[PDB]
């Protein structure tokens, strides 16, 4: 005999997921009971929203599938933001949601009567209800197959309460369904590889830019090797920063491409799983020039040439493309030109921007955000996972995070939902309890999930939560003040409360840092503690980060 | 010329809503700028989830329309729980959600690419996106008309960013819900219902949420007093019936009558067969009884039990028509005092028996805490209930409290809705007292709203009964599966009083039942947001927890 | 200045679509007005249902994108069956549907108040509403990109009337958006190709089976070559029959694999864009053995191992795989084993089945269906397009269609929606007016769209509609009689009406065939006429096609 919950855990075991995140409820308890016997670990949270965000962070940091367990009704609805965030971010998460019993369907009963699949459908690759317990292993396998393959994304499986508690015979409990984990991925053809490498060799000022989809299929090694073989500068968005960071050819976030002169602009750009959008300054061309020869490799043809003309488009796996290109570039008969002058100009461009912003900083009595984020970047150990939340907070960190020796940098996606950081950091920590996890967040955002400090305490997850407190919803205040004037700032000031105070009351290490000098030592000690820590950093609200201009009007200086 | 933000505030003003709840964002700012110029009040929160819940409580306590302002993307999605809660609870809330700019539609831009209307459609009476700025007054009025008329429910209007910032010429007035006539009982129907009532041996009235919407209870109390019929209700309807001497409190009190004493006629005023009625089991409303059901949705008539007569009309208007005719009823009304005395003996006997059977340990008994709270709340105050075991225990004492409105869990039963609900309920009337009775697990959802209350001057008294666990879920595991099977339900960490203090609120801990009532009294007199952490015992099983699990409450 | 209708016609021109199908209305009329000026051809039909099916058939026979134009309200809703059909069949059709004006939204006006995007969403790859006329070129290009790349499928674009009638600058018309026509497709990697060929050479009894996604790409030449190099028997489902037919290694429909002995069953199977489903007898193994080594190439990982365990899975374009595999197979160092004995046994099985089923025919007064479809198969010209409708009709045609020299055989997909044939052939005919198009349909199915005889006459589309008239809803009648008994036959008999009479009244050539000897001569003359023709063949109801037993559960024999 096997219950439906047993069937769920067994399939999750076969998929090699060690942790799931949820809040217990009677509808979903059969999964928890199975996890107790099979000694599968479920980390409970204080909001189901952060249970989903934890699965996201677990997936993003672990380079694995993430699983969230949601009970019926409000258990599901509280997770919708995480589903939406994973949807836009191309993140592989499986959401398991209990539902009302089918046998008493339409009885106005507890936590029932909500079409959870319909709510989830617009923001999932697949949302389906499992109506029979025997279907459970096969349908979860299909869900995982969909979620884990490009473009990655969330899947919702709704399992009614009486389907979860129903039983099947041990024979069906043991048959093996296809998880696609060893399925061969869309690679670049021989003819395509020669065309791409040919144009690259012919370029005067070529650049590679990587995106999330390159990371989700361990394309980092291949892309770095290809960049190093060809000597092409490597850029990326936040989701791929860890994939490119190790390469000497790495130049960090692609926002650094701004500022080149008219002749200096890149003539050829090869995109590895990056979409035209917020990260590229849309099709404006300030980062990726419209007159440049753009080579786009993405798993969804809807992205090819979306906002900008592209010279060549490939509908394939960006990770496999890098490997195929790296292999052929090694034995490339013509050899590769010396791009040292091009590389040096970009290094002067990127390093100049860091230097100029630091020089231009105007200091008041409170800590300058540029000084704070420089402190954090210079202190985080090699191989660290850094999570970024808050708006002005993450915009400032974007100037220094490229210098940090990070395994993964988890920042805001297209949804740009403030508050996702704490839950995300929690799940990233559950990926490796040994590895350091630092969350840099704003004072407004951290308020979304204050109770999650208790979850980290009870689960033993030593995230260091660095709160840059400007005493406001910062960027929203800036938008009002800069665009409409200082008379128009309204409903954005947060001049109350101690976040270190809240975290301490919830059992975590808590410290305040009003002095820039005390930041780096305090962070160093926080990492050594092996304890959940909140560092409240009192910073100035006034400084406008360079990237803040881009989003309102570009032209950042 | 007026911006779309101005048009929203203009219609909200004509709709007679003075407070809105949201978190500001760049997409929705046109509304905030209009509110600043118009001196319209927007209360900011720490989570858009509680911005939505504030609108529900503002609506539920205020007997008015509630309005939530949600910015694009995560702003909207964070409120989905509130929409779903209002959906099942039949609560009139207008959710206004910004969206991406239409001019840069499908550009992978900020907070965009989400079909907010499709996401909201299954849990709203109406979900629609406004594509042109000129349509705003007419479409908002349509939304309000839908939201405010029976059965009440949430409506979502999605307004793209470039629609909000667009302008129109100043040149009319659109029809909102108010002054519409509602479905009353016909003259023939009134006589048939009243005729059967006079003939009844043991008649009972039960009121539901839809009676409260529309000020039904004044009429319902009179009719119960005129006919001498015992008056019952669910939690949303408790305040409507509470004042009547014919009131017997929450309808769970009907359990326990013997087979002959069992009620013979039941008239439902806007209450649905469901969790509140123990579905069609008959333990509260007997299946053998002649049931007369008055609801606005024919899908509700006889859903789980046979009904003798069903009317699709407005329950508030039904009470008025019936009360008028009962006053001049030629035959007169029989003396039900023996039946009422039996019911009073039943209800009060239960309160006393539960108090007697209490097993006390070193920590505060949950029955003692809610008895203290009920006897301490001022008259006409709003009491909000969250947590599972917490609200289930409160169900035994809340009827005796002199409460204006009792805001408890609906069918969604989503733990965490309490704080936002209480915050918005307080914004309805800042002077009148609001007490939230919540569990330790539930209050963790919205801990940061203590900061919102401080900045907004909303003096909610948050009473946290702390059992150091997600209580009812632990009980379900322990009672059904055994004590070895309890897993993922224990919360033996943290000080919620400590958390509130760090956010600027009044904070106190209560370890002895003797100090509870005095402490609550100061908190109410303080005029400050207050958190009272009451350390209570986890073990005692509230009687209603068995009904949720399996019939038989004792 | 350009109207929105001009923009839509201009993009369709760039996508190289010469024909679109619709029914005129005031809402969508600007597209018709722009097409009149630009000499873009719109074929009107008698039902929007067949306007959609015409776009499907045009796309399937034409190996191109199909476009259907629907006016607001009922115009859109009448096409829903066609959208669902393309959805399950993986057919690339772009549906452009007008809607009510945004300026009079929610005014209870004509043909308005219907959420056409919401209705289409469950049955489309993308369903979207165009709110501003400026977005028109970019959104259509995105729509086309989604529709044309694997897995192909339908896309719905909703354009409000007042957006269509709105105007934009000429410069906006000049800019070119990406139609993905030269985007490169997911190919097999060098490592991947080596693994597959290695297993193929080692196989004792390998088979290739092709599916719809091989034909949407140009994989037939590469697949036939690969089959010829390696000597591997080639099979397919109906949508790929035309892709394999030319090869001497082709053995026709994959249903012909049934009946081999346990030792004889294939040990290795390579699937090229075919899904486990109705075409494969699900995961039953009667066609594709469950213990066989299966290599599956599909565009969606949700299909990999859906109903059967697979040895190897590739998420790529099946057409590109055939090309990569064919190139390496040619120069395969080991060479290829002599599969002569395996080929002879398969030919013995396939040809033996044809002779046996014909031999087993018991004839009554009316024409036997096996003789009728044998005549049709033996008479249709080379390079002909055959469309199949009706139930028992298409099941019988399955026994002979493999022998017909057809360029494309358009038969029922998973939807199995009776009535699609007439519209499909109409659009299939519009692809190439010179090429012959023969539709073999049942009496019930042809009743769905009798008025399209008027469309074929007026448009000059000379479809030959052969109606196999059993005077009943055949397969449903058989299901009642076979499972429940002859007394339980109810609501399935159609003993009335002359379909030849109807076609004649609508201006088509009409002939009745009561004697099998006249069938082939009549078809030859009808094909030579160059006029729309209806041939009503009075056929026997009694004979049960072998495949009907499989559709019901049991074996073919
Ligand atoms: C869920 C959600 N609500 C509202 C917004 C709008 N918004 C963008 S930035 C910002 C301010 C964030 O303040 P804080 O977390 O203190 O960070 P800071 O900008 O001050 O560094 C807000 C409210 C959003 N992005 N997401
Ligand atoms: C949103 C949501 N998540 C989870 C549940 C499942 N659930 C029912 S009761 C309960 C425990 C509530 O704990 P607390 O608020 O401390 O109240 P107590 O039962 O301890 O009195 C939980 C998690 C739910 N009903 N709603
Ligand atoms: C749209 C649709 N409606 C109904 C059916 C059910 N159905 C399956 S076969 C069949 C009979 C078809 O009769 P006819 O077209 O005369 O072909 P025959 O089986 O007689 O050869 C019917 C009604 C269907 N498959 N599709
Ligand atoms: Mg801040
Ligand atoms: Mg509790
Ligand atoms: Mg027939």
């Amino acid at each position: 005999t096997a219950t439906g919950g047993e069937l769920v855990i067994r399939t999750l075991e076969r998929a090699s997921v060690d942790v799931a995140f949820g809040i217990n409820g009677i509808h979903i308890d059969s999964i928890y009971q199975a996890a107790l016997d099979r000694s599968f670990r479920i980390v409970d949270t204080r909001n189901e929203m952060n249970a989903g965000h934890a699965a996201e962070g677990y997936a993003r940091a672990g380079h694995r599938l993430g699983v969230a367990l949601l009970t019926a009704g409000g258990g599901f609805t509280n997770a919708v933001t995480s589903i939406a965030n994973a949807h836009l971010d191309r993140t592989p998460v499986l959401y398991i949601a209990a539902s009302g019993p089918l046998g008493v369907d339409e009885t106005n009963t507890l936590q029932a009567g909500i079409d959870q699949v319909a709510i989830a459908t617009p923001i999932t690759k697949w949302a389906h209800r499992v109506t029979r317990v025997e279907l459970l292993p096969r349908l979860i396998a299909q869900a995982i197959r969909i979620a884990t393959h490009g473009p990655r994304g969330p899947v919702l499986l709704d399992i009614p309460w009486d389907v979860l508690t129903a039983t099947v015979d041990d024979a069906l409990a043991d048959g093996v369904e296809e998880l696609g984990a060893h399925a061969l991925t869309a690679a670049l053809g021989a003819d395509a590889v020669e065309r791409i490498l040919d144009g690259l060799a012919g370029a005067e000022r070529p650049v590679f830019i990587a995106g999330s989809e390159l990371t989700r299929g361990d394309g980092g090694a291949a892309l770095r090797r290809l960049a190093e073989i060809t000597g092409t500068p490597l850029f990326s968005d936040t989701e791929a920063l860890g994939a490119i960071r190790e390469s000497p050819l790495s130049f960090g976030l692609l926002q650094g491409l701004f500022g080149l002169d008219e002749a200096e602009r890149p003539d050829r750009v090869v995109l590895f799983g990056l979409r035209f959008g917020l990260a590229t300054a849309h099709g404006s061309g300030i980062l990726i020039p419209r007159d440049a020869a753009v080579v786009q490799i993405d798993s969804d043809a809807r992205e090819l040439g979306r906002l900008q003309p592209i010279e060549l488009g490939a509908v394939g796996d960006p990770a496999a493309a890098a490997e195929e290109l790296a292999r052929a570039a090694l034995t490339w008969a013509a050899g590769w030109p010396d791009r040292s002058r091009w590389q040096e100009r970009l290094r002067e461009l990127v390093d100049g921007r860091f230097e100029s912003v630091t020089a231009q900083a105007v200091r008041d009595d409170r800590i300058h955000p540029m000084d704070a984020v420089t402190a954090i970047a210079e202190t985080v150990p090699a191989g660290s996972v850094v999570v970024a939340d808050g708006a002005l907070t993450y915009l400032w960190l974007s100037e220094t995070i490229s210098r940090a020796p990070v395994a993964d940098y988890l920042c805001h996606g297209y949804l740009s939902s403030m508050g996702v950081g704490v839950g995300t950091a929690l799940g990233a920590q559950a990926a490796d309890v040994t590895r350091p996890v630092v969350l840099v967040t704003g004072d407004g955002a951290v308020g979304y999930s204050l109770g999650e400090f208790d979850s980290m305490v009870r689960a033993g997850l030593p995230v260091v939560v660095v709160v840059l407190n400007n005493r406001a919803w910062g960027a929203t205040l800036h938008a009002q003040e800069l665009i409409l004037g200082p008379d128009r700032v309204v409903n954005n000031r947060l001049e109350n409360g101690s976040y270190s105070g809240v975290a301490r009351a919830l059992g975590a290490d808590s410290i305040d840092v009003s002095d820039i000098a005390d930041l780096a030592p305090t962070l160093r000690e926080a990492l050594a503690s092996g304890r959940p820590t909140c560092i409240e950093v009192h910073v100035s609200l006034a400084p406008v980060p360079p990237e803040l201009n881009v989003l309102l009007g570009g032209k950042p200086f």
Side-chain angles (χ1 to χ4, degrees), chain A residues 1-203 205-402 404-434 436-557:
Chain A
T1 273
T3 68
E6 285 177 67
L7 302 179
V8 164
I9 299 292
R10 292 182 183 174
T11 318
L12 289 196
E13 289 166 345
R14 294 175 25 214
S16 319
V17 19
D18 318 345
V19 180
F21 311 83
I23 297 188
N24 181 251
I26 206 173
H27 295 72
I28 194 98
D29 199 47
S30 176
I31 298 194
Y32 285 73
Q33 289 305 310
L36 182 60
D37 311 328
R38 297 201 71 98
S39 143
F40 193 96
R41 173 168 190 188
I42 299 167
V43 170
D44 74 77
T45 51
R46 294 321 293 257
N47 191 324
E48 272 97 352
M49 98 156 177
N50 291 293
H53 289 320
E56 297 176 70
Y58 179 87
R60 285 154 92 212
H63 303 95
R64 40 193 323 162
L65 172 82
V67 177
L69 308 168
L70 321 161
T71 196
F76 160 81
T77 60
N78 278 324
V80 164
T81 294
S82 158
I83 303 174
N85 196 48
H87 165 73
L88 294 195
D89 282 358
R90 282 168 168 197
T91 305
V93 180
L94 169 58
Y95 299 86
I96 288 147
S99 130
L102 296 179
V104 289
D105 164 44
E106 288 301 298
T107 49
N108 283 331
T109 189
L110 154 111
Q111 293 168 250
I114 306 287
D115 192 352
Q116 306 178 165
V117 165
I119 294 159
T121 299
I123 52 190
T124 50
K125 330 172 76 191
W126 195 42
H128 189 80
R129 187 206 249 163
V130 180
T131 45
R132 308 274 169 104
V133 57
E134 323 83 31
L135 303 172
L136 253 165
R138 172 164 62 84
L139 295 203
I140 304 190
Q142 187 187 322
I144 290 161
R145 271 183 335 249
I146 290 161
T148 52
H149 286 86
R152 273 100 184 167
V155 170
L156 180 106
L157 275 184
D158 174 307
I159 314 166
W161 186 7
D162 42 6
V163 173
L164 269 178
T165 57
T167 65
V168 318
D169 277 25
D170 283 292
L172 187 141
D174 281 319
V176 157
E177 303 278 335
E178 178 60 66
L179 301 170
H182 312 292
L184 291 193
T185 212
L188 229 49
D191 286 15
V193 159
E194 207 220 321
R195 284 172 68 197
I196 302 204
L197 284 189
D198 216 65
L200 179 63
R205 291 168 316 276
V207 288
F208 295 157
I209 310 186
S212 95
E213 274 285 310
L214 181 106
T215 307
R216 308 266 191 268
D218 316 303
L223 181 51
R224 282 184 314 244
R225 214 201 323 145
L226 165 74
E228 285 150 28
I229 297 162
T230 54
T232 306
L234 247 179
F235 285 84
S236 91
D237 64 343
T238 66
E239 268 315 279
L241 181 56
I244 67 148
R245 167 198 79 88
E246 292 177 280
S247 180
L249 264 303
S250 154
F251 290 82
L253 299 188
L254 79 156
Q255 59 185 60
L257 279 156
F258 182 77
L260 280 166
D261 272 348
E262 226 155 5
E264 311 220 274
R265 288 180 79 37
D267 55 358
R268 165 153 329 258
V269 186
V270 187
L271 298 170
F272 280 93
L274 186 71
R275 293 170 282 182
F276 290 110
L278 204 60
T280 69
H282 303 90
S284 84
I286 61 164
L287 309 187
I288 307 161
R290 307 189 49 97
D291 45 307
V294 176
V295 179
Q296 194 179 346
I297 306 137
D298 199 89
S299 33
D300 186 342
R302 95 172 56 208
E303 305 299 333
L304 297 177
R306 197 199 265 254
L307 313 177
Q308 218 169 130
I310 56 149
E311 197 216 53
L312 189 103
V315 198
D317 178 60
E323 180 60 55
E324 305 314 295
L325 285 159
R327 302 217 190 160
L330 196 72
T331 60
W332 188 255
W336 294 98
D338 175 80
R339 310 243 185 239
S340 83
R341 186 218 29 111
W342 176 222
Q343 296 154 12
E344 223 143 65
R345 175 66 189 103
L346 283 201
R347 203 94 257 173
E348 152 208 10
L349 189 81
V350 163
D351 290 353
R353 167 164 179 146
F354 179 84
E355 237 37 81
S356 313
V357 165
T358 317
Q360 283 332 100
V362 42
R363 321 277 215 297
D364 69 337
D365 41 330
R366 305 180 94 221
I367 292 163
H368 199 288
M370 185 61 178
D371 286 337
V373 294
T374 301
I376 289 164
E378 292 185 345
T379 321
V380 283
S384 292
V385 168
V386 182
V387 184
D389 198 353
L392 293 178
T393 305
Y394 95 78
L395 293 175
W396 270 116
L397 189 59
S398 78
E399 305 296 314
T400 72
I401 189 56
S402 303
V406 296
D408 304 280
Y409 179 43
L410 315 195
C411 194
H412 276 292
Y414 292 158
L415 186 65
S416 216
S417 197
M418 317 281 122
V420 307
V422 179
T424 304
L426 182 142
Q429 188 67 82
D432 204 20
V433 182
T434 91
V437 173
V438 186
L439 161 63
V440 191
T441 194
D443 52 310
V446 82
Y448 272 83
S449 319
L450 286 188
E452 248 39 84
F453 282 119
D454 161 79
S455 321
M456 325 171 109
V457 165
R458 282 173 307 107
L461 302 173
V463 174
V464 178
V465 178
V466 180
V467 171
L468 300 201
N469 186 347
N470 35 56
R471 287 180 306 210
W473 301 104
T476 38
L477 190 145
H478 283 224
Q480 289 181 335
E481 167 132 350
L482 299 163
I483 285 326
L484 307 179
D487 40 314
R488 303 316 312 199
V489 189
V490 56
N491 285 94
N492 277 319
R493 255 163 216 289
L494 292 162
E495 325 201 283
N496 177 70
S498 168
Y499 305 106
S500 72
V502 177
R504 186 196 318 122
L506 293 179
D509 290 356
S510 76
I511 326 161
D512 284 73
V513 173
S514 296
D515 311 284
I516 190 45
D518 319 344
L519 195 57
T522 305
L523 179 55
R524 235 177 276 119
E525 304 199 9
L527 292 156
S529 36
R531 260 154 260 165
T533 306
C534 171
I535 307 186
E536 176 162 354
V537 193
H538 304 273
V539 310
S540 355
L541 173 73
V544 176
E547 282 297 305
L548 185 59
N549 309 0
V550 186
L551 324 152
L552 320 157
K555 307 301 215 43
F557 183 57

